[PDB]
Design a protein around this ligand. Structure first.
Ligand SMILES: [K+]
Length: 122
DNA sequence: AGATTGTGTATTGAGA
DNA sequence: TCTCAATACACAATCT
């Protein structure tokens, strides 16, 4: 059967950039997946909408990109879940922090910062 | 026990 | 035309 697929009018930043920004601006520079999902939802009204598949995309990003590093909730449970996630900025591909040229940014360029690197790198 | 997490697999389509 | 971030679903294993 044909696979379902749709592109959504998501914010014009990569999921990587948005995740990295919420982690880096958290008090301990670490967040669980549950906490990341909550904080991402604060960034833009799109994430308060009824499309929820971005939550899966965020999970995907944490595993897929090497810049996201799991920190064990319990050091004696290396197979435990609900761990913290950190960002290693030296592993981030810099261009993935730039504002994306999508229909969403073209609709109103001036409400979107051109680069999130200033809010990620110290 | 279903919800959640972490990762594997795979397809998609707009920017470049 | 082509890349890869976006998106979708499987599945094992933990979590509550
Ligand atoms: K990772």
């Amino acid at each position: 059967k044909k696979k379902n697929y749709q592109r959504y009018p998501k914010p014009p930043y990569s999921y990587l950039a948005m995740i990295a920004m919420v982690i880096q601006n958290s008090p301990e520079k670490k967040l669980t997946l549950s906490e990341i999902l909550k904080e991402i939802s604060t960034l833009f009204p799109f994430f308060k909408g009824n499309y929820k598949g971005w939550r899966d995309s965020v999970r995907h990003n944490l595993s897929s990109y090497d810049c996201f590093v799991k920190v064990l909730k319990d050091p004696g449970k290396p197979q435990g879940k609900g761990n913290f996630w950190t960002v290693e900025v030296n592993r981030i591909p810099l261009e993935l922090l730039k504002r994306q040229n999508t229909a969403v940014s073209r609709q109103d360029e001036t409400i979107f910062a051109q680069d999130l690197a200033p809010y990620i790198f110290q």
